[PDB]
Amino acid sequence: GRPRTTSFAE
Amino acid sequence: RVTMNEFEYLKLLGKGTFGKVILVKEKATGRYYAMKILKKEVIVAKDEVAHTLTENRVLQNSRHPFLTALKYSFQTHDRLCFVMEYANGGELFFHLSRERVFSEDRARFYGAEIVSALDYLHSEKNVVYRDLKLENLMLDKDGHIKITDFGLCKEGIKDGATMKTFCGTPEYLAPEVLEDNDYGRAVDWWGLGVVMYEMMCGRLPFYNQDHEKLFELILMEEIRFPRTLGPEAKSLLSGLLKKDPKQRLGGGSEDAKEIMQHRFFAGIVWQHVYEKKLSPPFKPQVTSETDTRYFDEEFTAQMIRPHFPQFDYSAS
Numbered sequence: 001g002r003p004r005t006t007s008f009a010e
Numbered sequence: 011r012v013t014m015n016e017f018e019y020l021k022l023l024g025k026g027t028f029g030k031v032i033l034v035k036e037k038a039t040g041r042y043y044a045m046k047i048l049k050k051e052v053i054v055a056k057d058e059v060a061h062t063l064t065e066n067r068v069l070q071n072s073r074h075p076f077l078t079a080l081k082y083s084f085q086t087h088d089r090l091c092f093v094m095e096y097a098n099g100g101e102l103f104f105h106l107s108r109e110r111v112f113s114e115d116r117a118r119f120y121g122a123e124i125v126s127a128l129d130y131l132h133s134e135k136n137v138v139y140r141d142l143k144l145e146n147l148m149l150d151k152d153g154h155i156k157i158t159d160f161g162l163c164k165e166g167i168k169d170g171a172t173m174k175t176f177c178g179t180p181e182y183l184a185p186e187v188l189e190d191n192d193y194g195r196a197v198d199w200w201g202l203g204v205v206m207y208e209m210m211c212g213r214l215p216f217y218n219q220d221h222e223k224l225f226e227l228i229l230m231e232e233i234r235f236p237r238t239l240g241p242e243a244k245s246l247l248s249g250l251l252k253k254d255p256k257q258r259l260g261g262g263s264e265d266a267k268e269i270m271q272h273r274f275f276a277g278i279v280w281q282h283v284y285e286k287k288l289s290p291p292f293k294p295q296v297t298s299e300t301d302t303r304y305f306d307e308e309f310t311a312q313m314i315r316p317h318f319p320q321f322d323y324s325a326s
């Protein structure tokens with residue numbers, strides 16, 4: 001019950 | 011000796027914006043695999059070149075039972091493909107979404123294997139993984155952890171050596187990364203805390219949809235502890251999620267060894283953990299080599315530029 005998250009890098 | 015033509019494409023399994031992951035068959039052997047397919051120009055364009063090499067070298071130089079093994083990498087005019095072990099039990103994210111929380115024993119078991127794998131990456135490959143989260147944690151047919159997606163690793167990190175890149179997943183970033191400080195492999199113990207927290211608590215330790223409200227919770231607030239949490243688990247979560255990395259469990263020179271000896275893990279035999287002699291507490295119920303029941307229907311119900319020098323690879 002938490003939305004799917006997203007990997008990133010600055 | 012491998013191309014796009016050596017495989018059958020069966021189901022969609024995942025889809026990020028950089029690529030897709032599809033369940034494949036190898037014509038020549040009969041075996042099923044998971045193939046990550048990146049469009050070369052999307053990778054150049056959205057700047058993912060460095061990341062893609064990091065995944066490729068980290069997959070090739072790793073041999074550990076809780077890490078996704080690579081069988082081939084090969085390229086086309088337009089694609090980069092990794093052909094890897096297929097994790098048939100799907101993401102942890104999937105299971106924890108249905109069950110809400112895991113028991114302490116089940117979370118203990120996964121945490122054991124995770125710690126075993128990260129110890130190895132730290133001590134043997136000199137790599138910090140950086141992006142531990144429920145989505146990057148899958149099970150195989152027997153119910154054993156597999157870690158997938160390796161593009162955010164730092165290579166060549168040895169002992170307490172420090173590093174700078176702002177990266178990972180917003181919900182999982184460690185204070186010292188938010189603080190804009192140099193950081194070390196203890197970030198992976200933070201990430202292990204957040205995952206153990208979600209398994210046993212049923213939510214993230216710090217939540218807000220807005221990143222800057224979430225980053226403020228991370229740097230500013232003590233964690234909350236449901237009253238269902240036993241004292242050993244309370245203590246582990248308290249130590250993995252100390253905000254100062256020097257004070258964090260696994261943050262010293264002993265690294266994973268400080269975690270393995272915590273009373274939360276009493277009477278787990280670490281050697282048996284590695285050798286896979288512990289009984290998985292959930293055995294995936296798959297009817298066949300191609301049963302995608304633990305993958306979200308959103309994907310499975312979907313219908314089917316430079317040269318990278320020495321990208322190509324092959325295990326036997």
Ligand SMILES: Cc1c[nH]c2ncnc(N3CC[C@@H](N)C3)c12
Nearest residue numbers: 023024031044094095096097158
């Ligand atoms: C990336 C990957 C390697 N092996 C896999 N086996 C099953 N599924 C995978 N993916 C499903 C969606 C992502 N979580 C990655 C993979």
Ligand SMILES: [Mn+2]
Nearest residue numbers: 005006180181
């Ligand atoms: Mn988010």
